[PDB]
């Protein structure tokens, strides 16, 4: 009947604590294939464009309730059987520029995660589109046109059964969203940026490997005499050389049927892979599993407590190579009992007090990584 219920239990605001399913409202099969071109995008949609009209538990609020303030969380039930593992990454960054880019050193790095197409059951990644803080209204990425993804780098060298495109489920969670930023006053505890740099196409047999590589950091990365500035790389420089305990995150996007053990550290990228006894620098390493796979790192100042350059010029050298980095060496006699080839990840979430200073008036020459 009569009532100024014009307030009552009607003015619907609710930053919503729906059960992560009383919150669930998505329905899109995450693409999955075999006859595939290395980096294989299993899509890149939108936030609001994504769809219009999706019958689920949290419903009217997508464009109703007003604002909430948790992390737009996901879990995509996948798997396959047992034979080989693989890499995948979901893209989430900012708005867009023009006919842009589509990779793991690109689409992701704003806020990201890293997963395998057959590991036990599923991966997690709680997306909160606003870095600036937290809370959120419908627009902020809509009218700020960002698009997201899902894709390998590595892959299950053993191409399997069919094209299992699983389910992409999200909405949110009541988590304490962390407002990401990076302190100009360079030398600092912790580090944000992320830095994409994994994988390592490893042959079967035991080719006496040690596929070196630096640890130079800066801007972004190449493409056929073409490059790519990102958020883990450029404000993440300005200064010249970089100085701190950052550490990577390797993984077995390869095999529980093919293994290998590869050190990870800081020696000297002026020593070609054929050293007498290469296992000769302050160690850390592989020894993969059907189960085990994701790995990280840790390399500080008891270790290098002295500068190397977050930069380079297309004409920088080895037989005049300054500084130590992670240029790896196997150990074990590589395998497969089949027709395979190994791999190994690389990444930079947060350091142990990083010394940045100085500047680099300029070059580029986006090191082939």
């Amino acid at each position: 009947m009569e009532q100024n219920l014009f307030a009552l239990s009607l003015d619907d605001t609710s930053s919503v604590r729906g059960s992560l399913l009383d919150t669930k409202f998505a329905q899109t099969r995450v693409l999955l294939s075999k006859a595939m071109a290395g980096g294989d995008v299993l899509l890149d949609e939108y936030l609001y464009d994504v769809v219009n009209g999706q019958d689920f538990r949290a419903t009217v609020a997508f464009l109703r309730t007003h604002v909430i303030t948790g992390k737009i969380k996901v879990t995509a039930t996948t798997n396959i059987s047992d034979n080989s593992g693989c890499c995948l990454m979901l893209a989430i960054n900012s708005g867009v520029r023009g006919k842009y880019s589509t990779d793991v050193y690109t689409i992701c790095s704003q806020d990201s995660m890293t997963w395998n197409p057959g590991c036990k059951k599923n991966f997690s990644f709680t997306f909160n589109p606003n870095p600036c803080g937290d809370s959120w209204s419908a627009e902020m990425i809509s009218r700020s046109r960002v698009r997201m993804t899902v894709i390998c780098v590595s892959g299950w060298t053993l191409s399997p059964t069919t094209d299992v495109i699983a389910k992409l489920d999200w909405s949110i969670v009541n988590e304490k969203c962390e407002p990401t930023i990076y302190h100009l006053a360079d030398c600092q505890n912790w580090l944000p940026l992320n830095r994409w740099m994994g994988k390592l196409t490893f042959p079967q047999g035991v080719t006496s490997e040690v596929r070196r590589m630096p640890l130079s950091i800066g801007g972004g990365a190449g493409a056929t005499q073409a490059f790519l500035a990102n958020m883990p790389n450029s404000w993440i420089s300005m200064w010249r050389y970089f100085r701190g305990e950052l550490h990577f995150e390797v993984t077995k996007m390869s095999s529980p049927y093919i293994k290998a053990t590869v050190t990870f550290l800081i020696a000297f990228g002026n020593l070609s892979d054929a050293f007498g006894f290469y296992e000769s620098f302050p160690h850390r390493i592989v020894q993969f599993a059907e189960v085990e796979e994701k790995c990280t790192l840790v390399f500080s100042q008891q270790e290098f407590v002295t500068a190397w350059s977050t930069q380079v010029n297309p004409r920088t050298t080895l037989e005049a190579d300054g500084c130590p980095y992670l240029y790896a060496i196997i150990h074990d006699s590589t395998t497969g009992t089949i027709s395979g080839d190994f791999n190994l990840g690389v990444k930079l979430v947060g350091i142990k007090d990083f010394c940045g200073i100085g500047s680099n008036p300029g070059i580029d020459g986006s090191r082939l990584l």
């Binding site: 880019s101 073409a226 490059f227 008036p361």
Partner: protein, 189 residues
Amino acid sequence: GPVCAEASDVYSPCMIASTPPAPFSDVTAVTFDLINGKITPVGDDNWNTHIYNPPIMNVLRTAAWKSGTIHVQLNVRGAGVKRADWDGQVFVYLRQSMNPESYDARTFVISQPGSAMLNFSFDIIGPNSGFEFAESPWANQTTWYLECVATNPRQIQQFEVNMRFDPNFRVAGNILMPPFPLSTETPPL
């Protein structure tokens, strides 16, 4: 007067271009972007936006959410046109869109020789959470640019742009990114 003395700090730029043909026509002016993305003017350009890929700068080009001090500047290049066989004005007018509507934010002096600079700052800021961006559809926007004159091309060869990534720079960005390869430096002293 000239007690030029104790100057200081660090400085990065952007690209570099020039006031045009001979062949060529009647007084124009270069109206390009003051920060990122579409970085060229309109009409009879052919000035060649010799785009450079600067540090703190593509960082500009690739800085969506954008908070933090800058000390933009200009300076010009001409020729062996005697100080008397000269007259080379300009007057800055940087704003946030520029048009037969709009009203340019700022302006700035000159009128003499080739190498005639300018150097200052635009208190960057923003709306949502105090930071902004290139007419980004949330409530609406505008963005940085500048009107770098051209009221006599056989007076001024080049135009110089430069940008200062300050401390008050609470940045963000990683915008959705196309080409960032290079065009660094041709050195013809």
